[PDB]
């Protein structure tokens, strides 16, 4: 799993 915060960081 990739965490929800890491996903948001990568998109931001």
């Amino acid at each position, epitope marked *: 799993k990739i965490s*929800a915060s890491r996903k*948001l*960081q990568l998109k931001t």
Partner: single-chain antibody, 235 residues
Framework: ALTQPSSVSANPGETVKITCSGGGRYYDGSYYYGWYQQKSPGSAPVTVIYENTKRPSNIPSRFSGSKSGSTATLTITGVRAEDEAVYYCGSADDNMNPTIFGAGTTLTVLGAVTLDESGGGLQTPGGALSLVCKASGFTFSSYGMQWVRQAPGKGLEWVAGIQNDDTGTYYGAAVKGRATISRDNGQSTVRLQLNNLRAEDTGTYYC?????????????????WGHGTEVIVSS
């Protein structure tokens, strides 16, 4: 946000199912949910299942979790009266909110990790408070940490989170621009500064440890909760 039923009832010994939907799709294309049990408003939530299926070792074997499509189900096989509680599901939304909670399902039955919050108290509207959580019993620098609050008689509400490496500080919509989360990995502490306080910020504020393997956090992955500290805002 997330959708779960307001209530479920069962007789002792039956199998109970509670289903939650509405979570955002994660980076790996899947969906992930956590289940958080609260037996009384005067007590901290307890994670019964996280990351869809993972059961903390101290949680009774009768709790299990599953996922189907974008939905998740908590199953209690052989329910007991002691299982009466509100069960909140948690996940992430599609974009800006890594942690979101359902409204809670109330179950009626017919017939070494420590997190220690401080800094609560009474404040007047417009003032500020600084909350602190001291952690022990785990490698603090490896894990994301979060703050979650609960107004009197209301459900769980995400306040803020921070990744293990100090980055990824994100905030709940109701506190945007008024909250700052920080952490000190050397002291095993996470801090929440709340400014421009409002009456409706009143509630119990819980520190929460995340279990995500990558040092991040989200609503599916809280594995430990503090005892809470009370914030009371009133003029």
């Amino acid at each position: 946000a997330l959708t779960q039923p307001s209530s479920v009832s069962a007789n002792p010994g039956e199998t109970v199912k509670i289903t939650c939907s509405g979570g955002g799709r994660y980076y790996d294309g899947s969906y992930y949910y956590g289940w958080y049990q609260q037996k009384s408003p005067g007590s901290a939530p307890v994670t019964v299942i996280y990351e869809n299926t993972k059961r903390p070792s101290n949680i009774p074997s009768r709790f299990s979790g599953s996922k189907s499509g974008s939905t998740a189900t908590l199953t209690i096989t052989g329910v007991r009266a002691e299982d009466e509680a509100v069960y909140y599901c948690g996940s992430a939304d599609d974009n800006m909110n890594p942690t979101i909670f359902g409204a809670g399902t109330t179950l009626t039955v017919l017939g070494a990790v420590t997190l220690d919050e401080s800094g609560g108290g009474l404040q007047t509207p417009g003032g500020a408070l600084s909350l602190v959580c001291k952690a022990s019993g785990f490698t603090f620098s490896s894990y994301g940490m979060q703050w979650v609050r609960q107004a009197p008689g209301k459900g769980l509400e995400w306040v803020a989170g921070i990744q293990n490496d100090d980055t990824g500080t994100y905030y709940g919509a109701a506190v945007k621009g008024r909250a700052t989360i920080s952490r000190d990995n050397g002291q095993s502490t996470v801090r929440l500064q709340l400014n421009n306080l409002r009456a409706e910020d009143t509630g119990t504020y819980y520190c929460a440890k995340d279990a995500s393997s990558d040092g991040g956090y989200g609503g599916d992955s809280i594995d430990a909760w503090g005892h809470g500290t009370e914030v009371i805002v009133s003029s």
